[PDB]
Structure 1
Amino acid sequence: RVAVAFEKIDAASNGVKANSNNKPFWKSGATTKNYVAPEAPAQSEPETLDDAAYQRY
């Protein structure tokens, strides 16, 4: 017997399968109310303040 078969095949890694993007519609949906994150503004990184000496002022 040779017995090929074409079927949808996936794997997992310790808590979750691979096809969890396109879940069936009854499996997910309407669990909680949804927030929206605001725009976090990205500023530059600074320098220092040495002097261990202005820090009490």
Structure 2
Amino acid sequence: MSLYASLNPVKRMTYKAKEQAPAYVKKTGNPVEDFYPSSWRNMAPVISLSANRVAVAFEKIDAASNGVKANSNNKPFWKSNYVAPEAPA
């Protein structure tokens, strides 16, 4: 019913919904965690259209080149040195 109400355009004006203020989370200055936190990051909605069926579902999006994935930067901990000297000028 929330999806149906989100897609109905005439209920969008005759029933103007109220804003909900978000929960308090601390800002850290860096925008990569301020605007795209890990609780949301890379989620995006699938639209599947079949006979009398419209389905939308938010999924985490990844792509890949030669063999490793895009979100492999953030692999889980169970899947997881010398310091190089500085070069002179």
Distance 1:20 1:27 in 2: 10
Distance 2:57 2:86 in 1: 49
State the identity as a percent: 100
Shift of the alpha carbon at 1:20? 1.4
Runs of 4+ aligned residues of structure 1 deviating over 3 Å after TM superposition are none
Distance 1:15 1:36 in 2: 28
TM-score with structure 1 setting the length: 0.59
Please identify which structure carries the higher strand content.
2
Q: Say which of 8, 16, 20 aligns to 2:72.
A: 20
- 2:84 aligned partner: 37
TM-score with structure 2 setting the length: 0.39
**RMSD of the alignment, in Å?**
0.8
Please identify which structure carries the higher helix content.
2
Q: How many residues align?
A: 37
- 2:42 aligned partner: none
